């Protein structure tokens, strides 16, 4: 039987669609041997790697307050430590329920930083440290890994997997009418280079592999008003490929 | 004889080294048939394309004040450029300037490269120079600094039909850990990162025939205009050193 690696692309609000993919994949009895994730893909995939069920991930997403950069940085770190209190005495990420890699960016040098050991919470928090939303973290000064490897196919392949299931939740560009402020222009820039490394990795997909691309046409990148829809989106997108995933 | 295209990479303060390259190139009698530039490379190269001498470019750089806010500086930069270029008002096609010229910019809405080849020289150069968080973007497409898509526009210059390119890379140094204080700092760094990545890509396409000039700018702050004379000397000396290699064009 083939080793299957699950790659979970970066985002924020949009990355809760990852939950619905897991929910489908589990239902369909697809066994994941390795997970690689950036930002939200790293949160969802990390919690799942640690032992959470997609159903519990769903319950947690529907029951918490998504309603300055440093204060939110600490708040995110304390939530992650609470959820992961059961993996305190873990150090090697290969020895979690499922092997797991988070991906982050060394803001000083631009180098990709793949975590494979240490403190799961702290590593996941690095991968999730979106500039102008969560302060970077010091472990190297570290940020959201979207700008270097948003869809870390190659990371997952260096865990020795034969096939990858890749979930691209997309990073839509802002429309001309929404580019009001200077912050808006620069996020757009980050979005542009994020897509460019994303497209590059997606280029390396082979015959064997499976791309999942949830229908998220409507969906605001930071908009957590529609969780149930986001999760359904990933659920349905994956349910549709039940036939193709079956042959793994 | 070969058609020589001069490519002038993007920057800000560091791009005044471009002046010293022109100053050398002229001295050495190297004839330029086409110019392509981004940001500062576009200002210096555009003014030179229009008929300024490198000497006058140097005089202008040594005698002016580099000492809601993004927009006010945007207008100020536009009025300076219109003053300097008042003689090319009735120009429309950039191929009919003293030297053919292309400025390069970025459509911030779509990420597409925007190469200007016609219209109003000042307005186009101002687009190429519209560095986010320093000069408001311009509406012509909402347009910014072309560094993020083609900082070293070798391919633009080659689409003007040149056989050889002289490329001036002034570099975009990354900020060190100790200088990354604010959120603005982190995001500039990001822009720097993608700027280098497209820069390295174009530099990859250079051939046997072509000539890369890379001024010694080790010290130099990207926004630091306190050392103009050094910046110009840097480009001057870097080019003077290759007098032999440029001679065979
Ligand atoms: Na340390
Ligand atoms: Na550090």
UniProtKB/TrEMBL annotation, chain A:
Short motif GXSXG, span: 37-41
Regions annotated as coiled coil: none
Location(s) in or outside the cell: Membrane
Residues in PNPLA domain copies: 6-157
Motif DGA/G in this chain: 144-146
Catalytic residue list: 39, 144
UniProt name for this protein: Patatin-like protein, PlpD
Organism this protein belongs to: Pseudomonas aeruginosa (strain ATCC 15692 / DSM 22644 / CIP 104116 / JCM 14847 / LMG 12228 / 1C / PRS 101 / PAO1)
Residues of the full protein shown: 22 to 311 of 728
TrEMBL record, chain B:
Organism ancestry: Bacteria, Pseudomonadati, Pseudomonadota, Gammaproteobacteria, Pseudomonadales
Source organism, top-level taxon: Bacteria
Domain PNPLA: 6-158
Motif position, DGA/G: 145-147
Motif (GXSXG): 37-41
Residues of the active site: 39 (nucleophile), 145 (proton acceptor)
UniProt subcellular location: Membrane
Gene: plpD
Name listed for the protein in its UniProt record: Patatin-like protein, PlpD
């Amino acid at each position: 039987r083939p080793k299957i690696g699950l790659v979970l692309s970066g985002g924020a609000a949009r990355g809760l669609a990852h939950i619905g993919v897991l929910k489908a994949l589990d239902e369909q009895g697809i066994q994941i041997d390795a997970i690689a994730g950036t930002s939200m893909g790293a949160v969802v995939g990390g919690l799942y790697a640690s032992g959470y069920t997609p159903a519990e991930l769903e319950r947690i997403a529907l029951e918490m307050d998504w309603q300055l950069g440093v204060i939110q940085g600490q708040n995110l770190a304390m939530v992650l430590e609470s959820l992961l209190v059961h993996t305190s005495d873990n150090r090697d990420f290969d020895k979690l329920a499922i092997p797991f890699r988070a991906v982050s960016t060394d803001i000083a040098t631009g180098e990709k930083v793949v975590f494979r050991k240490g403190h799961l919470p702290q590593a996941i928090r690095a991968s999730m440290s979106i500039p102008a939303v969560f302060a970077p973290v010091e472990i190297r000064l570290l940020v959201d890994g979207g700008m270097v490897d948003n869809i870390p196919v190659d990371v997952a392949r260096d865990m020795g997997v034969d096939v990858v299931i890749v979930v691209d939740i997309g990073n839509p560009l802002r429309d001309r009418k929404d580019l009001s402020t200077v912050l808006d222009v620069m996020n757009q820039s980050i979005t542009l280079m994020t897509r460019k490394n994303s497209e590059a990795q997606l280029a390396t997909l082979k015959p064997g592999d499976v791309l999942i691309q949830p229908p998220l046409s409507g969906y605001g990148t930071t908009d957590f008003g529609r969780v149930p829809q986001l999760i359904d989106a990933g659920y349905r997108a994956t349910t549709v490929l039940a036939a193709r995933l079956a042959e793994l």
